[PDB]
Chains A and B, each alone.
Chain A
Amino acid sequence: LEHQAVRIENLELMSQHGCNAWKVYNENLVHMIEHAQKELQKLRKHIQDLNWQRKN
């Protein structure tokens, strides 16, 4: 009974407010993925330059 009341209160607050954190955290994860892609691009550029010098 007490656990059902506490769960009813937690559901009352969560349903009483909203979320927005799934979208916010989704945007944050998108930013992190963008940073990782940038780092991979930089590494590929450096490897390409080294391969060019070795080719010369």
Chain B
Amino acid sequence: MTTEAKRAAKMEKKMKILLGGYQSRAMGLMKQLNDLWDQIEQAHLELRTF
């Protein structure tokens, strides 16, 4: 309990960099993935349309 919450608390406090940067890579990666899928589907749909 003591040492476990101390090591996990210190490691969790030192992980804020990977959490913020990884949350930014997941954020922009998911936004670019959804926007790229919808942009590709609408792109091919408009290309076949016209």
A interface with B by C-beta (< 8 Å): 4, 7-8, 11, 14-15, 19, 21-23, 25-26, 28-30, 32-33, 36, 39-40, 43-44, 46-47, 50-51, 54
A4 CA to B11 CA, complexed, in Å: 13
Q: Could you tell me how many residues of chain B have their Cβ less than 8 Å away from some Cβ of chain A?
A: 29
Chain A residues touching B, majority SS: helix
B39 near A11 (CB under 8 angstroms)? no
| Given the contacts A36-B39, A40-B39, A19 and B18 also touching, CB distance less than 8 Å | yes
**Interchain CA distance A44-B43 in the complex, whole Å:** 8
Listed in ascending order, the chain B residues whose CB lies under 8 Å from chain A are: 3-4, 7-8, 10-11, 14-15, 17-22, 24-25, 28-29, 31-32, 35-36, 39-40, 43-44, 46-47, 50
Q: Is the interface of B mostly helix, strand, loop or mixed?
A: helix
Q: Check B43 against A39 for contact (C-beta < 8 Å).
A: yes
* Inter-chain contact B25/A22, CB cutoff 8 Å: yes
**A47 and B39 form a contact (CB under 8 A):** no
